From a paper:
pmcThe specific interaction of proteins with the nucleosome is central to the regulation of chromatin function and dynamics. The tardigrade damage suppressor ([name]) and vertebrate high-mobility group N ([name]) proteins bind specifically to nucleosomes via a conserved motif whose structure has not been experimentally determined.
To this end, we reconstituted the [name]–nucleosome complex with recombinant [name] [name] and the nucleosome core particle containing the 601 nucleosome-positioning sequence and performed cryo-EM analysis. Two [name]-bound nucleosome structures, which differ mostly in the dynamics of their DNA ends, were determined. In “structure I” (2.8 Å resolution), one DNA end is flexible, whereas in “structure II” (2.7 Å resolution), both ends are unwound. Importantly, the two structures contain extranucleosomal densities that correspond to two [name] molecules bound to either side of the disk. We refer to the [name] molecules as “A” and “B” depending on whether they are bound to the face of the histone octamer proximal to the unwrapped or wrapped [name], respectively. In both structures, the PPRRSSRLT segment of [name] straddles the long α helix (α2) in H2A and has multiple anchor points on the surface of the nucleosome acidic patch and the H2B α1–L1 elbow. Furthermore, [name] R367 interacts with H2A E61, D90, and E92 (with the exception of [name] molecule A in structure II, in which E92 is pointing out) and thus functions as the arginine anchor that is found in most acidic patch-binding proteins (Barbera et al. 2006; McGinty and Tan 2021). [name] R364 interacts with H2A E64 but was poorly resolved in one [name] molecule, suggesting that it is more loosely attached than R363 and R367, which are buried within the acidic patch.
Author numbering:
A (entry chain D): 34 to 123
B (entry chain C): 15 to 116
C (entry chain F): 24 to 101
D (entry chain E), F (entry chain A): 41 to 135
E (entry chain L): 361 to 368
G (entry chain B): 23 to 101
H (entry chain G): 17 to 114
I (entry chain H): 35 to 124
The structure:
DNA sequence: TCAATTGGTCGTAGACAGCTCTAGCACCGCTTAAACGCACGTACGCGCTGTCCCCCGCGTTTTAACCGCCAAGGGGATTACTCCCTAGTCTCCA
DNA sequence: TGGAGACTAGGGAGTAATCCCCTTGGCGGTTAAAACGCGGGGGACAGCGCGTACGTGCGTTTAAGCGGTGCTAGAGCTGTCTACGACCAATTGA
């Protein structure tokens, strides 16, 4: 949470190879990632609490994503999360 | 190699793991929770950056500024629903004049 | 006393950014009152967050948190 | 120019820019005046006053966007304080 | 190939 | 009776009552028909459907309050879909 | 199919009268039906998400209560 | 612990709830006492207005209608419980003058 | 989840002869469990914000002052500070 | 001496 | 009969004293961009008049909601195996 | 000088089985509510006229903003050290 500036830079590098980003735009992207992190993690905590569970795992994160993200955004985010866990487990 | 390159990501799954375990969300944190969170965060970041870089190129610019981020978010219905209570600093508004006034 | 420093040109600029064509003369005092109420609500919470940390200066995070708790999350100030 | 194409030009100009539409010094003075009612000898960061202004201006612009809709609903192009009151009452700010 | 979304 | 007096009596009648104003069986069938698009063979606790009806009825009554405000804003007595759309858009439900 | 017509015009104007409305346009009933359908689709989706996370098949009043909390509407009296 | 503070709400149960709810790694000693004193005061404030509303309706019991009538007729409790639906509570009797 | 006994007992000292319906106390249980989770979530935040690991009566005070409106906070804080004084009095 | 509120 | 309290270690969390240097404030001067005041005209708000159409009130007819009362089975809580799971710890040079 | 790799161990969750309750399905009767038609009337909307208030332009004034100067409060980080909460064991009563 100290910064995602390196990682937002890598993603921008791989998405728009030539386009750079401003120092004020990066602060907004860091705020965006910190806000979305909090939103997903708090919902995952509530999800674990409702089920009387003491661990937060991939299912809690995915269900929090589906609850939070609207429409097709949720479908594609769920697909990317699933692919990442599938490749990491392998 | 690294835990982000294990998953094929760019966001740090180790850092997300530490933030999950320090934030008092649960007594325990699973192994795939940091990876899933990092993947979803990376996907949303990539979406916003792609649309922002498209908007900046429509303004004949080679640098994303907060105005381009606001344009990209407000012009996408799903991202507008996601960030619907969010104020973007130095972002402005969508250019929209009511048809009655014209 | 400094509510009249939010001048009529400034309020009219804010309205033109909102898409307003004509502005009645009684709008400016109403806008000043509304801004006064909004600023009071945010600043009370920000100062509460300031005194809690036993600080004497109001931090940008103190404002950002006082806004997050009114459902007006603001990106760009950490 | 007649009465009202300069208004449209201004709408286009200020809907295209992203600057702060309120002067910084009077707004800072207002912020300090309001804060003194809660704590005495309060200090402020420059980023704190800038965040307050960035939030206040966005809130006011968004409220004017709803005031305009309330004015169009009543077959009018002039926004009036009753439009502000209706918009604020509907979004639950103050009944 | 730039990282381009498949989203609508 | 003159048109409106029975309307005011009906307002007073349904404003001091607390019962649910929609029939329970049609609302239950609507709820199951809607839920059929998200999962099949879905059972429902009776309290679940009762909570859905209470929330839906409170939501519609609160929305009709705003619709009536938008009707009065346009110097009218009859609520029109225009008013519902204005209330929903200012509430943020719509665009 | 076509269970939205079970929310009849008399029930809609009963809710309108509780909302303080005197006169109602004849196009209000379809608009209200669409609005109610939107609200119910939004709530019974979070409710079914909460239900499937619990690996259950009955939708509990607690799932509805939480799905209402998620949309900012707190409900009192159902546990 | 509830008797020492002069409370009626359970300080021990608030303590266990605070510890189990993972609100912080540690929970203090006056935290449950303060929290119970806050919940009990708010409960007594609602239960007085709803109960005055029960005598204003010539009732000897309190129903959800009385709780809603008490909450919405109090500006502070209405602002506090502003996004709260009370089941079988109705609405405040109110007709516009057009 | 169930505060029925204590809501009954506070009722007897404010309105001795008045009763509560089953649905009316199923509502006050929701009110108590809601305001408890409001204060314990704001106080949880106020501890993290100061990089603090314990929730104290100071944080409960600040959360009550942030969540409760106007004169509710003035009168709830004055009762919280009076029940701790008596709790820790010899 | 019923318990009342000074609010 | 288990929960609500009590008593006694122990270790760390946090309070307090002491520097440190950042940044917040107070002030001045110059420039000038923006605010302010006035004069004017016209467009828009608002108040009438008139039409007519659509909504309401009411008197029948119909329909299906609601209330009991049976019958069956799914599936939500439990409770004891069972192990796979993560927190914890140590090494450790990226 | 953070997270990655490799063990160790307790325990949280997964699984099979049970059990009962509560959800669904059917049926019949009653009557309350929905639906349908009809006849007015009142409210919505259109058109017109008036007058005043708001936009516009111009000239004057006034503080905002920028660029320096300087001073010090207080935020921020150590370093110490103690006292208070976690943990465990007794214990006893609602």
């Amino acid at each position: 949470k100290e910064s995602y500036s390196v990682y937002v830079y890598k993603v921008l590098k791989q998405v728009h190879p030539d386009t750079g980003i401003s120092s004020k735009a990066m602060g907004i992207m860091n705020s965006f990632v910190n806000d979305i992190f909090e939103r997903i993690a708090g919902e995952a905590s509530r999800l674990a609490h409702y089920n009387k569970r003491s661990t937060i795992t991939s299912r809690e994160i995915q269900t929090a994503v589906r609850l939070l993200l609207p429409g097709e955004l949720a479908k594609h985010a769920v697909s990317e999360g699933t692919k990442a866990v599938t490749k990491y487990t392998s | 190699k690294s835990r982000s390159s294990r998953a094929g990501l760019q966001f740090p799954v180790g850092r997300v793991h530490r933030l999950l375990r320090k934030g008092n969300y649960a007594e325990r944190v699973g192994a795939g929770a940091p990876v899933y969170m990092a993947a979803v965060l990376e996907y949303l970041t990539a979406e916003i950056l792609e649309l922002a870089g498209n908007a900046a190129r429509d303004n004949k610019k080679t640098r994303i500024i907060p105005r381009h981020l606001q344009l990209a978010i407000r012009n996408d219905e799903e991202l507008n629903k996601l960030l619907g209570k969010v104020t973007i600093a130095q972002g402005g508004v969508l250019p929209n004049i009511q048809a009655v006034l014209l | 006393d400094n509510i009249q420093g939010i001048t009529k040109p400034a309020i009219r600029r804010l309205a033109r950014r909102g898409g307003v064509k004509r502005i009645s003369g009684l709008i400016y005092e109403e806008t000043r009152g509304v801004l006064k109420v909004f600023l009071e609500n945010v600043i009370r919470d920000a100062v509460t967050y300031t005194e809690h940390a036993k600080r004497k200066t109001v931090t940008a995070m103190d404002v950002v948190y006082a806004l997050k708790r009114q459902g007006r999350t603001l990106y760009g100030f950490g | 120019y007649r009465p009202g194409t300069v208004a449209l030009r201004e709408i286009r100009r200020y809907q295209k820019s992203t600057e702060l539409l309120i002067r910084k010094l009077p707004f800072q003075r207002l912020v300090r005046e309001i804060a003194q009612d809660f704590k005495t000898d309060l200090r402020f960061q420059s980023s704190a006053v800038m965040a307050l202004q960035e939030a206040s201006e966005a809130y006011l612009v968004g409220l004017f966007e709803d005031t305009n809709l309330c004015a169009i609903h009543a077959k009018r192009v002039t926004i009036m304080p009753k439009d502000i009151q209706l918009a604020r009452r509907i979004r639950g700010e103050r009944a | 190939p730039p990282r381009r979304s498949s989203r609508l």
